[PDB]
Amino acid sequence: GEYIKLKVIGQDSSEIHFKVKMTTHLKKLKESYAQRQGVPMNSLRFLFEGQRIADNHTPKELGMEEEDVIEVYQE
């Protein structure tokens, strides 16, 4: 089926998982994560295999798959 689940790991090793489509712009994940952490989205950088995830990157563009990890670091 079409949602994949991505694991977002915080600096404190906490995890929030997100269900997204392959075509979803990951800005929406970044905004949801920042909201739930209580911090401004622009205070964070989101990385996939160490590379910065842009607002308009999609899982398809980045080659993401079910249960791939995103790491969040301070900007």
Binding site: K5, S14, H17, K19, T24, H25, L29, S32
Partner: peptide, 17 residues
């Protein structure tokens, strides 16, 4: 911590404001 899964949602004539 418990598992947390968030579903990200997709990307007028009823309006009054």
């Amino acid at each position: 911590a418990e598992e947390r899964v968030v579903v990200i949602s997709s990307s007028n004539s009823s309006s009054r404001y």
